[PDB]
Amino acid sequence: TRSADKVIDESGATQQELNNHSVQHVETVADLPTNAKDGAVLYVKGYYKPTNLALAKPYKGGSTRVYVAQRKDEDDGFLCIRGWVLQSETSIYTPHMSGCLCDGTTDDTLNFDKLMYALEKNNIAGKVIINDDMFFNSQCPRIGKLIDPVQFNEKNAIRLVSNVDLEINATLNFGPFFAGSSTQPRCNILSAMYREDVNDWYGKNRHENIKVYGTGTLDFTQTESPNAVQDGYRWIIKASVKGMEVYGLTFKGGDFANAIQTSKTSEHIRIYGNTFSNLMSDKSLLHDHSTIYCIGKDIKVHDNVFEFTNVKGRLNACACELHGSEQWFYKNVVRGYPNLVFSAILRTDQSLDENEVVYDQKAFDNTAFISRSALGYWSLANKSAKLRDLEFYDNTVTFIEAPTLAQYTSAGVRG
Amino acid sequence: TRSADKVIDESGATQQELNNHSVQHVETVADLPTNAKDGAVLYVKGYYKPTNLALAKPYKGGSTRVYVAQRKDEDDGFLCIRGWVLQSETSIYTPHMSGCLCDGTTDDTLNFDKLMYALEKNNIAGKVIINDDMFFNSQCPRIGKLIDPVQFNEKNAIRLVSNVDLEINATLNFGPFFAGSSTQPRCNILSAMYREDVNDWYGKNRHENIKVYGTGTLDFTQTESPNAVQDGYRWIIKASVKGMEVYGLTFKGGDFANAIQTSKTSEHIRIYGNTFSNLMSDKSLLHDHSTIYCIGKDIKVHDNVFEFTNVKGRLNACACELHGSEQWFYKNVVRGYPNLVFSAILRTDQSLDENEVVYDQKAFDNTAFISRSALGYWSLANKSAKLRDLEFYDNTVTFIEAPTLAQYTSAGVRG
Ligand SMILES: [Cl-]
Numbered sequence: 053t054r055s056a057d058k059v060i061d062e063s064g065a066t067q068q069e070l071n072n073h074s075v076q077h078v079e080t081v082a083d084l085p086t087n088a089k090d091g092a093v094l095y096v097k098g099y100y101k102p103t104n105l106a107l108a109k110p111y112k113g114g115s116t117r118v119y120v121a122q123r124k125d126e127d128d129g130f131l132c133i134r135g136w137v138l139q140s141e142t143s144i145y146t147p148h149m150s151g152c153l154c155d156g157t158t159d160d161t162l163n164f165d166k167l168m169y170a171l172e173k174n175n176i177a178g179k180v181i182i183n184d185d186m187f188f189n190s191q192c193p194r195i196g197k198l199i200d201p202v203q204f205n206e207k208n209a210i211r212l213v214s215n216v217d218l219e220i221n222a223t224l225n226f227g228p229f230f231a232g233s234s235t236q237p238r239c240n241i242l243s244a245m246y247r248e249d250v251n252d253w254y255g256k257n258r259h260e261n262i263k264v265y266g267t268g269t270l271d272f273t274q275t276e277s278p279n280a281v282q283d284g285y286r287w288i289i290k291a292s293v294k295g296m297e298v299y300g301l302t303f304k305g306g307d308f309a310n311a312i313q314t315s316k317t318s319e320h321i322r323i324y325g326n327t328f329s330n331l332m333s334d335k336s337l338l339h340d341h342s343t344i345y346c347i348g349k350d351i352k353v354h355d356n357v358f359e360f361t362n363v364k365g366r367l368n369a370c371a372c373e374l375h376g377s378e379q380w381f382y383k384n385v386v387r388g389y390p391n392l393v394f395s396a397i398l399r400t401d402q403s404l405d406e407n408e409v410v411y412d413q414k415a416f417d418n419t420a421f422i423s424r425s426a427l428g429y430w431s432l433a434n435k436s437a438k439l440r441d442l443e444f445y446d447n448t449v450t451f452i453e454a455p456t457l458a459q460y461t462s463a464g465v466r467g
Numbered sequence: 468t469r470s471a472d473k474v475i476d477e478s479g480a481t482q483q484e485l486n487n488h489s490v491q492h493v494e495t496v497a498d499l500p501t502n503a504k505d506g507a508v509l510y511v512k513g514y515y516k517p518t519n520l521a522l523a524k525p526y527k528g529g530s531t532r533v534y535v536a537q538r539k540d541e542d543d544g545f546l547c548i549r550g551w552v553l554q555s556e557t558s559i560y561t562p563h564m565s566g567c568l569c570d571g572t573t574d575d576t577l578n579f580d581k582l583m584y585a586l587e588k589n590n591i592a593g594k595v596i597i598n599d600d601m602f603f604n605s606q607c608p609r610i611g612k613l614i615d616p617v618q619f620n621e622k623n624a625i626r627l628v629s630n631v632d633l634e635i636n637a638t639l640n641f642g643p644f645f646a647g648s649s650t651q652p653r654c655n656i657l658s659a660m661y662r663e664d665v666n667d668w669y670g671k672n673r674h675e676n677i678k679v680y681g682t683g684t685l686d687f688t689q690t691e692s693p694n695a696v697q698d699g700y701r702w703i704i705k706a707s708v709k710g711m712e713v714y715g716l717t718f719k720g721g722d723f724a725n726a727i728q729t730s731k732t733s734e735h736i737r738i739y740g741n742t743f744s745n746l747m748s749d750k751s752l753l754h755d756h757s758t759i760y761c762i763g764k765d766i767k768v769h770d771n772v773f774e775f776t777n778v779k780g781r782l783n784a785c786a787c788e789l790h791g792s793e794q795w796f797y798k799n800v801v802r803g804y805p806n807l808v809f810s811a812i813l814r815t816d817q818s819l820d821e822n823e824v825v826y827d828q829k830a831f832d833n834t835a836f837i838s839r840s841a842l843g844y845w846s847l848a849n850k851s852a853k854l855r856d857l858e859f860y861d862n863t864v865t866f867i868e869a870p871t872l873a874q875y876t877s878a879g880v881r882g
Contacts, residue, residue: 054469061471061486063502075490075510093492093510118512120520131523139512139529141561143598174523177598177636215598215636215682261636261682295682320742320772350772350800378800378834412800412834414863443863 081115081129081151084136090121094136099151113148115139129166131174143178145171147186156185156225161209165192168211172196177215177261182222182268188241189227197246202253204238206285212244214260220268220301230272232280232307232336239308241272244291245315254316254402255292262296264289272306272331278466280307280336287313288331297322304329307336310345316402318348327357328371334364337467341369342394347403350378359387363455363463366423370394374413374442375403381415390424390454395442399435411440418447423454496530496544496566499551505536509551514566528563530554544581546589558593560586562601571600571640576624580607583626587611592630592676597637597683603656604642612661617668619653621700627659629675635683635716645687647695647722647751654723656687659706660730669731669817670707677711679704687721687746693881695722695751702728703746712737719744722751725760731817733763742772743786749779752882756784757809762818765793774802778870778878781838785809789828789857790818796830805839805869810857814850826855833862838869 059067077095078084084094099113117136124135130150131138138149146152150167152160164186171178173196188209194200198211207230212218230239244259270288280286286308289298292315299322303311308331314321323344332341344353358371370391372381381393393415398404420426426449431437455463474482492510493499499509514528532551539550545565546553553564561567565582567575579601586593588611603624609615613626622645627633645654659674685703695701701723704713707730714737718726723746729736738759747756759768773786785806787796796808808830813819835841841864846852870878 058468059471059474059482060468062483067471067474067482067486070486070489070491073491073493075492091494091512093512116510118526120525122520137525139526140524141527141529141563142559142596143524170523176523263682322740352770380798382798382832411836411865412863414832414834416832416861441863441865445861 081133084117084133086134088119090119092119093117099148112154113146113151115149128170129163131170143176145178145180147180147182152186154184154186154222156223157187159189159227160186161188161190161192164188165211168213168216169193169196171216172211172213179217179219181219182224182266185223185225187225187227189229191229192243198243200247201250202247204285205236206238206240206243206290207236208240208243210242212242212259212262212264212289212291214262217263217265220264220266220270223269223271225274226270226272226306227274228277230275231277232283232286233277234279234281237281237283238285240285240287240290242289244289244293244296246292256317258317259291259293260295262291262293265297265299265301267300269302269304271304272308273304275306276333276336277307278335278337280338282309282338282340282467284309286338287311289313291315291318291321293318293321295320299323299325302327302329303331305333306331307333307338309338309341311343313345314347314351316347319350321346321348321351323351323353324355327359329359330362330365332365332369334362334463334465339368339467341365342373343370344372345375346373346379347375349376351376351380353381354383356384357387358384358389360389363459364465364467365389366455367460367465370428377410378412381418383417384419386418386420386422389420389422391428392418392420392422392426392447392449393444394428394430395439396430397437397439398430399432399437404437406436409438409440413439413442416443416445416447420447420449421452422449423452496548499532499548501549503534505534507534508532514563527569528561528566530564543585544578546585558591560593560595562595562597567601569599569601569637571638572602574604574642575601576603576605576607579603580626583628583631584608584611586631587626587628594632594634596634597639597681600638600640602640602642604644606644607658613658615662616665617662619700620651621653621655621658621705622651623655623658625657627657627674627677627679627704627706629677632678632680635679635681635685638684638686640689641685641687641721642689643692645690646692647698647701648692649694649696652696652698653700655700655702655705657704659704659708659711661707671732673732674706674708675710677706677708680712680714680716682715684717684719686719687723688719690721691748691751692722693750693752695753697724697753697755697882699724701753702726704728706730706733706736708733708736710735714738714740717742717744718746720748721746722748722753724753724756726758728760729762729766731762734765736761736763736766738766738768739770742774744774745777745780747780747784749777749878749880754783754882756780757788758785759787760790761788761794762790764791766791766795768796769798771799772802773799773804775804778874779880779882780804781870782875782880785843792825793827796833798832799834801833801835801837804835804837806843807833807835807837807841807862807864808859809843809845810854811845812852812854813845814847814852819852821851824853824855828854828857831858831860831862835862835864836867837864838867
C-alpha cells in the first residue's frame, strides 16, 4: 500500500503531482466534495441526477468548475457552489445550470432567479438561452433591483437584467399565483423596473440594454381569473430603461392592462416581430387594455401582430398608446381591436412635465381590422402639455362590426 | 519508488497508459509545459493569473488545448501557443482568449490583433464576442490585409475580418493616440480596407460578409483634439466590401469626416439600429462631417438615430451622402444636423466612372429636425456622370433655428 507521492511517471512526476493536475468528474452539484485542493477542477455531468438515462439529453446543467477555497462558504447555486466557481468564457447560460428543471410543470421561479440575480449582482453581460419549457408560479425574490420600497406589491416571475439577452425558444407557462385579486391586483411579470427608495415611483436608475427575444411563447392562460380587477399596474413587462428590444415572441392569454409599458425617462425602445394574442380575458373584471403603452422618447413599435379573438378585447382595447416624443407605430397588423392607435398627451407625473411639447409621433403602413377608431387623441382637461405634430399616413383600415350582445353573453364577458 | 508502467488498473492498463490519456490542467498560458507527449490535452484555467479570486469570474480566457509537437515553435498567443492548439468547435472567441485584459484602461490593441489576424491569416469564419470594456490606444499591426503600401498612414485600432461577426456588447474606448494631427491627419479606426499594392487606392480585393453589431458603445471622446485638422480620410469604418452589416451600436464623440464610408466597387451594405452622436467635436479644426458616405451599390441606411447636441455639428453636417446606385435612406431620425441627405454625383476615381448613370436613390419615412437643407444635390461642374432618378418621399421635416454666435463662442467652436 504505497503513497501516490512514491509512484513516478515517464515525465518524472509523482502520481500525486499528476492527480493534483487531473480534470476529474462528479455526477451532480450535490456531489461537489468539501475538502478538495485549492485550484482543483471538476466536470459536473449534470445539475441533478438524470431523470431518465434512455432519453437524448440525460445530463442537464452540467458545468466545469474550479474550487476557490477562499469562497468555499458562498453558495448561490449557480456561479459559486461551496467555492466551486462556474467556468463560462462567452457568458452564455441556461436555466438548467442554476437548477431549473425546465419540465414545463415544476415552479422554476426561485432557481431561475439564482441565475438572473447572480448576473445582476455581479454586473455580468451575457445571454440566457431557454430551450425547454418552464413554469413560473411564485414571487421572484424581492432583492437587489427587485426590492419594493414603494410597496406597489406587483407580482413578478422574472428578473430582467441590464446587458443580458434573454433568449426564449420554448414555452414559458405562468401559473395561477399571477392571477389578479382585489387584495393584490398588480403584476409586472418580467420586471425591468428598479425603484431605489419609497419616493422613486418611476425608476430613476434606468436599466440599460434589455433584450427579450426568441422563437418561443409566453403563455398566461393559467393566470386568467374572474377575480382579477382593473388596475393600470398589470403588465407583462414594465421597464424603466435606456435601450430595450423585445422581438420575435408570442404573448398569449392573461389579464393585462398593457403587455409592455415603459417609464417617464425611458429611451430607445424597439418592439417588433411579436404576436400579442388575447392579453385580457372575457371573464375577468378588467375593462380596458392597450397592448403597448409608450412612455419616454425614441420608441418604435413595428411588424407586430395584435389580435383579439375573444369578445371583450373586440369591445374595448387599443393596440398602442403614444405618450411621448419620437414614437412610431408602423407596419403592424391589428385584428379585431376597437382602437388602432392613441395619441395620449397626459400632463401627469408618470409622463409629461408641465409645458412639455410632444413631437414626432408617426403611425404608418399599418393594417387594421377595427370596429371603433383608427386614431384617438386624448389629453387631460385644462393642462399645460401640448402636441406639436402627429402624422398618420399610408394606413390601410377596414371598419368591421363589433361582436353582438349574444356573443358577449355566450362568452361570459364580465367587467 | 515504482514506475507508473508497473501500476495496473481494474481495466488492465498501466497508470502510465492512463496518465497519457488524462485531461490535465494548468493555471495560465505561461504554465503550458515545454516537454509534453505529442497529443497531450490541457484545460488552461485562465490566460493570466486571476487578478482577484473574490470576484464572480476570477478565471478569464481559459482554453482547452491539444499539444501538436510539430508546431511547438509557433506562438501567436491565441490559436497556437508553443504548439498547444486552441479547441473551439463553433469558432466563437473572446478577447480574453488572446490575452486582452478587457479592464477598460489597459491598451488591448496588440493582444486583440493576435485574435483578429489569426482569423484573417487562417480564413476562419466565426464570431468574436466582446462582453467587457476595452481600451485601444496604439496602431494595429500593419500586416496581412492591414499593410499600407499606398502609405496613407491611417491610424487603425481594429482589424475587421471577412466572415467574422464582431459582437460588441461593452464599451470600446479609443484613446488619445487616435487624435488627429497636422503630421498624421488620417484614421480608419475599425478597418475593412485591404490595399494590395501602391496603385490599389480603393481596395480592389473586397472583404466579404463583415458584421459589426451589438448592444455596446464605441466611445471616441478621448480621441478629440484641438490638433485634429480636416481630412476626408477620417473614419470609424472605411470598408471595401461585398456584404456588410453594421447594427445596434452607439458611436459617440471624436473628430470624423464620416462615421462609415464604403468604396468604389462595394456592394450590399446595411447600416441600421445605430446611434451616431457628436462624431465631430467643437474644438477641433474639422469643419465638415457626413455621417454615412455611401459609395458603390445596394446600400441601405435605416432605423438609425443621428444627433448633434454640440454647436459645430448643428452648424455644418449632413446625415447621409448618396454617391451611387440602389441607395436608400429611410426610417431614420436626424436631430440638429443642418442637412438631412445629399445626392452627390461625383465623376471622380473614388466613385463614378466617366458616363456612369446613377439610379434608384430613395429617401423615405425619415424624421428630420434640421436648420439648412432636407435634400442637397451636388456634382462636379462640366463632367460626364448623370443622375437618372432620386425619390424623396414621405419625410417629415421640421426646419429649426441653428445655434447662435453666442452659443458658438461659448462652446469654443474652431475650424
Ligand atoms: Cl409610404
